[PDB]
């Protein structure tokens, strides 16, 4: 149907926007602390601590499969990245501090994106 095609055009557009958002957000992590999933080989106990790991590459896999139906879902994953980091890592560490910086720098990008998704529909 043409109704179905139109929904698919809107999902595709959402995806194009969300890639721009992801690239913008990934630029606020120059160190690439959040670029890949935590290694279970290099932190074996990780899953005892964090129930829902998240990372930019996993967000990207999902994105290219148009797996994000709206901005809320993408926002939930981005927040997982930050929130997992601030639980596992202590306040004085380079990791915790990179999370905080990403949260703050990211909150701008997501403030305007939320307007662009409403504004463009």
UniProtKB/Swiss-Prot annotation:
Compartments (UniProt record):
Nucleus; Chromosome
Cross-link named Glycyl lysine isopeptide (Lys-Gly) (interchain with G-Cter in SUMO2), sites: 41
The chain positions of domain Bromo read: 9-113
Tissue-specific expression: Highly expressed in testis.
The superkingdom of the source organism is Eukaryota
What job does the chain carry out?
Scaffold subunit of various histone acetyltransferase (HAT) complexes, such as the MOZ/MORF and HBO1 complexes, that acts as a regulator of hematopoiesis. Plays a key role in HBO1 complex by directing KAT7/HBO1 specificity towards histone H3 'Lys-14' acetylation (H3K14ac), thereby promoting erythroid differentiation.
Description of how the protein assembles with itself and partners: Component of some HBO1 complex composed of KAT7/HBO1, MEAF6, ING4 and BRD1/BRPF2. Component of the MOZ/MORF complex composed at least of ING5, KAT6A, KAT6B, MEAF6 and one of BRPF1, BRD1/BRPF2 and BRPF3. Interacts (via PHD-type zinc finger domain) with unmodified histone H3. Interacts (via PWWP domain) with dimethylated and trimethylated 'Lys-79' on histone H3.
The name this protein carries in UniProt is: Bromodomain-containing protein 1
Q: Which organism is it from?
A: Homo sapiens
Q: Which gene encodes it?
A: BRD1
Q: Which residues of the whole protein are included?
A: 555 to 674 of 1058
